[PDB]
Amino acid sequence: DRVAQLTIGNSTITTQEAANIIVGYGEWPSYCSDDDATAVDKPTRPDVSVNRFYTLDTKLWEKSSKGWYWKFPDVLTETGVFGQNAQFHYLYRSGFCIHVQCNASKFHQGALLVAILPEYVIGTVAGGTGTEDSHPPYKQTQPGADGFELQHPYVLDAGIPISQLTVCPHQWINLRTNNCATIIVPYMNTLPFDSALNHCNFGLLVVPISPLDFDQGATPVIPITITLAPMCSEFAGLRQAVTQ
Amino acid sequence: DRVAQLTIGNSTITTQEAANIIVGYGEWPSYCSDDDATAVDKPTRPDVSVNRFYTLDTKLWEKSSKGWYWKFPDVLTETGVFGQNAQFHYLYRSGFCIHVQCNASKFHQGALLVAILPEYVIGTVAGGTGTEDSHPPYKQTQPGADGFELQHPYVLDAGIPISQLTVCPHQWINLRTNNCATIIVPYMNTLPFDSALNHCNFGLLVVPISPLDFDQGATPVIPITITLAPMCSEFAGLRQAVTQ
Amino acid sequence: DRVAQLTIGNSTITTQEAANIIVGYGEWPSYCSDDDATAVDKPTRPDVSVNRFYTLDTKLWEKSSKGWYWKFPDVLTETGVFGQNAQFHYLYRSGFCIHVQCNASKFHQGALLVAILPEYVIGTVAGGTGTEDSHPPYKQTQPGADGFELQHPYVLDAGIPISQLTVCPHQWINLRTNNCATIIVPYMNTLPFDSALNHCNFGLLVVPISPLDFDQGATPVIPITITLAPMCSEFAGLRQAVTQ
Amino acid sequence: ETILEVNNVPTNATSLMERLRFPVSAQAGKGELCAVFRADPGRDGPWQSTMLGQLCGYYTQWSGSLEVTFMFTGSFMATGKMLIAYTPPGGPLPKDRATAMLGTHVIWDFGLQSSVTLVIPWISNTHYRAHARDGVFDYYTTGLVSIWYQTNYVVPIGAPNTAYIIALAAAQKNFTMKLCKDTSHILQTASIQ
Amino acid sequence: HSTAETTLDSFFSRAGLVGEIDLPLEGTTNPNGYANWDIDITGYAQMRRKVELFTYMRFDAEFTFVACTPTGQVVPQLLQYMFVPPGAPKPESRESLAWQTATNPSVFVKLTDPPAQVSVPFMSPASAYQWFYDGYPTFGEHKQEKDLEYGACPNNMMGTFSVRNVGSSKSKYPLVVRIYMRMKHVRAWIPRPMRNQNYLFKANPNYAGNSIKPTGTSRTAITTL
C-alpha cells in the first residue's frame, strides 16, 4: 500500500512512499453518454497518444514559500499531442490523474497540502483599499505550465479559507511519511464538452501548511514536481489550430 | 514481536521497538484463593478504576547518571482511585504490569537494566567508616512517585552486586534495539494480603550499565518514563483514609 | 403487613409498626434507556457502594413544631461514596427509598404528614408587604443534611396549600398506628440525567398536622429520624471534584 | 476535517498563515503545557476556522461526538509523546498534566503514522446543546482540550529544534443539528455594488 | 553425573555454629549461673551467608548443644536448657520460678553425656522465615530514635533459649555452650546476590563504608594474567 505504479500510455510512474490513491468524488473518469451529449459529430478518442503522463515544470520548496497553483485543462494546451487536439478542436472533455512528487530525507520536515479546486476563480486585492474593481490578468488566471505563485494563500487569492480546502479531493505530502500525492479527477463541468482554451475545469493547489525545515548541511534544494495524465480524452468540432 | 499493545482499563500503550514481554517467575497475577486467605470480610475488587496504566514522573538520562529506583505498592498510594482504596483499606493485594519507556535515535547509544527486586531493603554507608549504625530516612526507603537516585549503584545501596541483579525478572533497553521494557509481576509476599503503606513488595530498578553517548548536535535530552498498571487488585479491612 | 424489612447495600432497616409501602406514581426506580439517553460516555453504576441506607440528622418533635423539609439530590452530596460520585461527575441520575422513623408510646399522640414534592421551589414572604422582590438564600433552598424548618407550613413557604400536598406520594405517621413511613421515588425530571449540585429533583416534607401531646411524666423527647437510600444510581461526565 | 486554528493569536497582516499550526519543541521535561482551547464548536474561537464551526452557525442546536486529528509535521528524526486531554464540563482549565490526565485523554506517540485522533465523546446532560457563549449560555459548554508533553520532543544534531502540529477537526457519525437560524455574522458593511 | 548434591536439603542439611553462650564463674557476662540467648542464627558469618542466598525459607531444624569448659574439658555438671517462646516468663536468676517448665520444653543433661540434640518444627506465624524484611513492624511516625526497628520482622523472632546450673549455689566450673543447627525439609524462594562485604551487626546489612572491598581478586592489567 505504500508502494505503487501508475502505467498509462507509454509512461510509468513509480513510488515507494505513497499514501494510497484518491478518486475525486468517488468517480472514475468516463466517456460521455449518448444521452448526455449534444454535439452530433463523431468525436476523436486518440487514446494512448494523449492519455499519458506529462511532466510539467519543477518548483523549489523554500522555508518561506507560500504555495502555487495550476489551472488544468490549460497546463497541457501547448504540450504533446494532447495540446494539438485541444487546439484543433472546439470541444474537449477528459479526466486527469495528477501525481505530485516531492522527496527529502528522514531529517527534513514539512507538509504540503495538494488539493483540487473545481472552477478555481481568482480574485484581486482590489487595490488594497477595496474600492478599485480590478481584475486578474490573463497571465494569472491561466498561468500555463509554469504555474503561478499565491500572494495570499490564507484566502487562496479568492477570498475563501484554505483551512476548508480539504472538502475538495486532496492529499498531503508529509515528508516524514510520503513523498508524493496521487489524485484521480473525473470530468467535472455543467456541460458534456467545453473549450480547453476558454475554460479551466479546476485548479491544482500545492500549499505548504507546515513550513519546510532542516539543519544546515542537509541538501537545501527540495523540488516539487508535477506529473499529470489525461484520461478518457474526447475532442469534437474540428477546424484549424487556435491558440486562444 | 517487535510491536505490541497493552490495553487495560481505559488506557492503552503502544510500541514498535519492544523486546517481548517478561512474566516474573513465570506466573500471571491472580486473585487470592479461598484457602490462602484469612481475612473473613469480603474484599473489594474495583477492577477497571484501579487496574489501569498510571504514568509517573519522567527522569532525564545523562552521560553521568547512576540510576534510580521506585518502591512499588508505594509509587501509587497517592494517585487515582488505586491510591484512595490503598488509603481507606488496611489490606491490599495486587500484581503489576510495568512498562519503562525510553527512546533515542539510530545515532545515540546506551543500555539500561530494568529489573524488579522483591523486598528491596535499602542500607546506608554507615557513616563511611562503618562504625555508625545509621539508617535510611523515610524519604529514601519510600521515595514515592518521584523515585530516588542511587548513590552507589554497584552495590545497589544495599551491599549486594548489581551484576547479579539479573536473577530477578528483568529486561534491558538497548537504544540500538528497543525503546521500552515490559515486565509483569505477580503478587509476591509471605502473606495473602498486606498493608500498601507499611510494606513495599518490591522495587523497580532502572540502571545505566552502558553509558549514554552521542555526538554534539543530536538532541541531548533523553527521558526515561515509567508507566505502570495494577492487576487483580483486591482490598479489605475498610476504615477511614490513612496516609501513613 | 405491619412488619417489614428493607435491605439494600450493606444496610438493613427493621420495623414492626409500618403502614405498607408507597411507590411514587406507581413506578419503581430504573436505569436510563438507550433511547432516552443523550450523553454518549459510558456511565458508572457503583451499585452497593452508593445504593444503601444513609441516616441523616435527627429532629426533635415539640408540641409547637411547624415542620421541616429536605431537598433530595442535595442531602447526600457530602456523604459517603454517593457524595463523591455526585461531586466528581457532572451528570447524576437515581431514585430513592425514603424511610422516616418516629416512635412514641401508646400514651402519646400526634400525626405527621410525610410527603414528596417534586421541584419544590421555595418562595419568600416578600418583605411582609409583598412589594419587595426578595429571594430565598442558598442556605434555605439547599439546606443540606440538616434540613430546614418551615416558617409558614400552611402555604409550604411557597404560596401553595399543604392541605392538597397529599396529591403527592405521601404517607402519615400516626403515633397510635405506625412509627414510620416508607416512600419509594423513581427518578423524576424532564431530562435523563442532571446535575446533583445545581438541581434538586424533589423535596421531602415532614409536617405535624395533628400536634404532638402527652401528659407530664411520659418521656418528652420524641425524635424524628430520616433514613434514605439511593436506587439505580448512574453518573457520567467525569472530571475533578466540584463542591458547588 | 478542516484545519482548526488552535493558534488563533497572530492578527498581523503577514502572520495570518501561522494560525493554521502551533509549535512544539525540546523542553525541560516537567510535563509542560503546549496548547489549550475550548471544545465548543459553535463558539467564538479556534473552531470558527472549520467547516463544521461554520455550518453550526446556521443551526441553533447540535448533538454528537466531535473529533480532532493532530498531524505532526516535524522531521523523520524527531520523536516525542504528547498527552491530549478532554475535560468535561465543570472542570476548570487543568493547572498541570497530573490534573488533565484525570479526564478523557490519549497519549500520542510520534512515528510513521503522523497523526492521532482525539475523540471528544458526546458527554452532555441535555440531548442537544445550543451554542455556548460567555455568561448564562456557558451552560452548554462542551469542555476543554489541552495538549501536554508526556515525555519530550527529542531530536538528533542536524535536525530542527522546533516543529509544528496541524489540528484538523470534524464531527462523528452521531452528530446532528436542528433549528435553522442565521449565522452570527453578515459579511457586508455597506450596499454591495 | 548426579545433580543430587545441589538440592536444597543437601546444601543446607549440615549442622553449623549459630550460637555460643558463656557461663563463667567471675565476670560481667552471665556470672550468676544462667543465661538468656535471643534465638537468632544471624550471629555467625558462615551459616548466615548461606541462608542469605535466599529471601524466604521454610524448614524444620535439628539443634545440637555442645557443652564444656573454656579449655574443652568435660566436667560432671548438670545443666538445664529451656525454650522460652515469646510471651513466656524469662528466668531472672538461677533459682527463678520459671525453671519449673510446667509447659515450656526443657532438656536436662550432664556435660558428661553426649551433646543434647532435639528436633524443632517450622514455628513462624508466617509461611516462611525472612532473612530480609524491607519495612517497619509498627505504624506511626518513624523518627531517628526508632530507626532501630527498620527491618525487624517479629515473624522471625522465635523466642529465647535459657541455660542454667541445676542448683541453688554457684557452679564449681566455668561453662560454654555452643549451639549447632541443621536444617531439614527445606523450601526456599527468591535467590539474591551473595554477601559481598564483611558482616558487622545482626539485625541489619550494614557494611564499613571506608573499607568497601571488591567482590574478588584484582590484577595489574586487563591484558595480562
Coordinates of C-alpha atoms in Angstrom, one line a residue, chain B:
Chain B
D1 CA 7.1 -9.5 18.0
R2 CA 8.9 -6.1 18.0
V3 CA 5.5 -4.3 18.0
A4 CA 3.0 -4.6 20.9
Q5 CA -0.1 -3.1 22.5
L6 CA -1.0 -3.2 26.2
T7 CA -4.6 -2.4 26.9
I8 CA -6.0 -2.5 30.5
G9 CA -8.7 -0.3 32.0
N10 CA -9.2 2.8 29.9
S11 CA -5.5 3.1 29.0
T12 CA -3.5 1.8 26.0
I13 CA 0.2 1.6 25.5
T14 CA 1.8 1.3 22.1
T15 CA 5.4 0.4 21.0
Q16 CA 7.1 -0.5 17.8
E17 CA 10.5 -1.4 19.2
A18 CA 9.8 -3.8 22.0
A19 CA 11.7 -6.9 23.1
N20 CA 8.9 -9.4 24.0
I21 CA 7.3 -9.4 27.5
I22 CA 8.6 -10.9 30.7
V23 CA 6.3 -12.5 33.2
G24 CA 8.0 -12.5 36.5
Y25 CA 8.8 -16.1 37.8
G26 CA 6.5 -17.5 35.1
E27 CA 3.3 -16.5 36.8
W28 CA 0.4 -14.2 35.9
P29 CA -1.2 -12.0 38.6
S30 CA -4.2 -13.8 40.1
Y31 CA -6.7 -13.2 42.9
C32 CA -6.4 -14.8 46.4
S33 CA -7.6 -18.4 46.8
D34 CA -10.3 -19.2 49.4
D35 CA -7.8 -21.5 51.1
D36 CA -4.8 -19.0 51.0
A37 CA -7.0 -16.2 52.6
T38 CA -7.6 -15.4 56.3
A39 CA -9.4 -12.1 56.5
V40 CA -13.0 -13.0 56.6
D41 CA -14.6 -9.8 55.3
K42 CA -15.5 -9.7 51.6
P43 CA -12.9 -7.8 49.6
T44 CA -13.4 -5.0 47.1
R45 CA -12.3 -5.6 43.5
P46 CA -12.7 -2.2 41.9
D47 CA -11.4 -3.6 38.6
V48 CA -11.2 -1.0 35.7
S49 CA -11.0 2.0 38.0
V50 CA -7.7 0.8 39.6
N51 CA -6.3 -1.7 37.2
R52 CA -5.1 0.7 34.5
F53 CA -1.9 2.5 33.4
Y54 CA -0.6 5.2 35.6
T55 CA 2.3 7.3 34.2
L56 CA 4.7 8.5 36.9
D57 CA 7.3 11.2 36.6
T58 CA 10.0 11.3 33.9
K59 CA 13.7 11.1 34.5
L60 CA 16.5 12.5 32.4
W61 CA 19.2 10.2 31.3
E62 CA 22.6 12.0 31.4
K63 CA 26.0 10.7 30.3
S64 CA 26.8 10.6 34.0
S65 CA 23.6 9.2 35.5
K66 CA 23.9 6.4 38.2
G67 CA 20.4 5.0 38.2
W68 CA 17.1 5.3 40.0
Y69 CA 14.6 3.1 41.9
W70 CA 10.9 3.1 42.8
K71 CA 9.3 1.1 45.6
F72 CA 6.1 -0.2 44.2
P73 CA 3.0 -0.5 46.3
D74 CA 4.2 3.0 47.3
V75 CA 4.6 4.9 44.0
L76 CA 0.8 4.7 43.5
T77 CA -0.6 5.2 47.1
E78 CA -1.3 8.9 46.4
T79 CA -2.6 8.6 42.8
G80 CA -6.0 8.0 41.3
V81 CA -8.7 5.6 42.7
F82 CA -6.0 3.0 43.4
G83 CA -4.5 5.4 46.0
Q84 CA -7.8 6.0 47.6
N85 CA -8.5 2.3 48.1
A86 CA -5.0 1.8 49.4
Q87 CA -5.6 4.5 51.9
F88 CA -9.1 3.5 53.0
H89 CA -8.3 -0.2 53.3
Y90 CA -6.0 -1.9 55.7
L91 CA -5.2 -4.8 53.5
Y92 CA -4.1 -4.6 49.8
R93 CA -3.1 -7.2 47.2
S94 CA -2.2 -6.9 43.5
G95 CA 0.2 -7.6 40.7
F96 CA 1.7 -5.1 38.3
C97 CA 2.4 -4.5 34.6
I98 CA 5.4 -2.3 34.5
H99 CA 6.3 -0.5 31.2
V100 CA 9.5 1.6 31.2
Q101 CA 9.9 3.6 28.0
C102 CA 12.9 5.5 26.7
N103 CA 13.6 6.3 23.0
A104 CA 16.5 7.9 21.3
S105 CA 17.7 7.7 17.7
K106 CA 19.8 5.4 15.5
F107 CA 22.8 7.6 16.3
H108 CA 22.5 7.5 20.2
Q109 CA 23.7 4.6 22.3
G110 CA 23.5 3.2 25.8
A111 CA 21.9 0.3 27.8
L112 CA 19.6 0.4 30.8
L113 CA 19.0 -2.6 33.0
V114 CA 15.3 -2.6 34.1
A115 CA 14.8 -5.0 37.0
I116 CA 12.4 -6.0 39.7
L117 CA 13.9 -6.7 43.1
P118 CA 11.4 -8.1 45.7
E119 CA 11.8 -6.9 49.3
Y120 CA 14.3 -4.3 48.2
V121 CA 15.7 -3.2 51.6
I122 CA 17.9 -0.1 51.5
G123 CA 21.1 0.1 53.6
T124 CA 23.3 3.1 54.5
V125 CA 27.0 3.8 54.1
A126 CA 27.3 3.6 57.9
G127 CA 29.0 6.9 58.3
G128 CA 31.7 5.9 55.8
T129 CA 33.9 4.2 58.3
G130 CA 31.2 1.6 59.1
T131 CA 31.2 2.1 62.8
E132 CA 28.0 4.2 62.8
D133 CA 24.7 2.2 62.8
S134 CA 22.7 4.7 60.7
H135 CA 19.5 4.0 58.9
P136 CA 17.9 5.3 55.6
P137 CA 15.3 8.0 56.1
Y138 CA 11.6 7.6 55.2
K139 CA 12.3 9.9 52.2
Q140 CA 14.7 7.2 50.9
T141 CA 13.0 3.9 51.8
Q142 CA 9.7 5.0 50.3
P143 CA 10.5 7.8 47.8
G144 CA 7.0 7.9 46.4
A145 CA 6.4 8.6 42.7
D146 CA 9.4 10.8 42.2
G147 CA 11.6 7.8 42.8
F148 CA 15.1 8.1 44.3
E149 CA 18.6 8.1 42.8
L150 CA 21.2 5.5 43.6
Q151 CA 24.4 6.8 45.3
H152 CA 26.3 3.5 44.9
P153 CA 24.7 1.5 42.1
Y154 CA 27.5 -1.1 42.0
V155 CA 26.2 -2.4 45.4
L156 CA 22.6 -1.3 44.8
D157 CA 22.8 0.8 48.0
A158 CA 22.3 -2.5 49.9
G159 CA 25.6 -4.2 49.8
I160 CA 24.7 -6.6 47.0
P161 CA 26.2 -6.8 43.5
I162 CA 24.2 -5.3 40.6
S163 CA 26.0 -7.8 38.3
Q164 CA 23.7 -10.5 39.7
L165 CA 20.5 -8.4 39.6
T166 CA 19.6 -10.4 36.5
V167 CA 18.4 -13.3 38.6
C168 CA 15.3 -11.1 39.1
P169 CA 12.6 -10.5 36.5
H170 CA 14.4 -8.0 34.2
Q171 CA 14.7 -6.7 30.7
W172 CA 17.2 -4.3 29.0
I173 CA 16.6 -1.2 27.0
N174 CA 19.4 -1.1 24.4
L175 CA 18.9 2.0 22.3
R176 CA 20.1 0.3 19.1
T177 CA 17.5 -2.4 19.7
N178 CA 14.4 -1.4 21.7
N179 CA 12.9 1.6 23.3
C180 CA 11.0 0.1 26.2
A181 CA 10.8 -2.8 28.7
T182 CA 7.7 -4.6 29.8
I183 CA 7.6 -6.7 33.0
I184 CA 4.5 -8.3 34.5
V185 CA 4.8 -9.1 38.2
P186 CA 2.5 -11.3 40.3
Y187 CA 1.7 -10.5 43.9
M188 CA 4.7 -11.7 45.9
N189 CA 4.8 -11.8 49.7
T190 CA 4.6 -14.4 52.5
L191 CA 1.1 -13.2 53.3
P192 CA -2.1 -13.2 51.2
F193 CA -2.7 -9.5 51.8
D194 CA -0.6 -6.8 53.5
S195 CA -0.6 -3.0 54.0
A196 CA 0.1 -0.9 51.0
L197 CA 1.5 1.8 53.3
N198 CA 3.9 0.0 55.6
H199 CA 5.2 -2.6 53.2
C200 CA 6.7 -2.4 49.7
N201 CA 6.6 -5.8 48.0
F202 CA 9.3 -5.0 45.5
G203 CA 11.4 -2.2 43.9
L204 CA 11.9 -1.2 40.3
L205 CA 15.5 -0.5 39.4
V206 CA 16.5 1.3 36.2
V207 CA 20.2 1.5 36.0
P208 CA 22.6 2.5 33.1
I209 CA 25.1 -0.3 32.7
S210 CA 26.4 1.1 29.4
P211 CA 26.6 4.9 29.5
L212 CA 24.5 7.1 27.2
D213 CA 26.5 8.7 24.4
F214 CA 26.1 10.8 21.3
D215 CA 27.8 13.5 19.2
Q216 CA 27.1 17.1 19.8
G217 CA 24.1 18.2 17.7
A218 CA 21.9 15.2 18.4
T219 CA 19.1 16.1 20.8
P220 CA 20.7 15.9 24.3
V221 CA 17.5 15.4 26.3
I222 CA 16.8 11.7 26.6
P223 CA 13.9 11.0 29.1
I224 CA 13.0 7.7 30.8
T225 CA 9.3 7.4 31.6
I226 CA 7.7 4.9 33.9
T227 CA 4.2 3.7 33.3
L228 CA 2.6 1.0 35.5
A229 CA -0.7 -0.7 36.0
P230 CA -2.0 -2.7 38.9
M231 CA -3.6 -6.1 38.2
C232 CA -6.1 -8.1 40.1
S233 CA -6.3 -5.5 42.8
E234 CA -8.1 -6.5 46.0
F235 CA -8.6 -4.5 49.1
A236 CA -10.2 -5.4 52.5
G237 CA -10.4 -4.1 56.1
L238 CA -12.3 -0.8 55.4
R239 CA -12.0 2.2 57.7
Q240 CA -11.1 5.9 57.3
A241 CA -8.4 7.2 55.0
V242 CA -4.9 6.8 56.4
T243 CA -1.9 8.5 54.7
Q244 CA 0.8 6.5 56.6

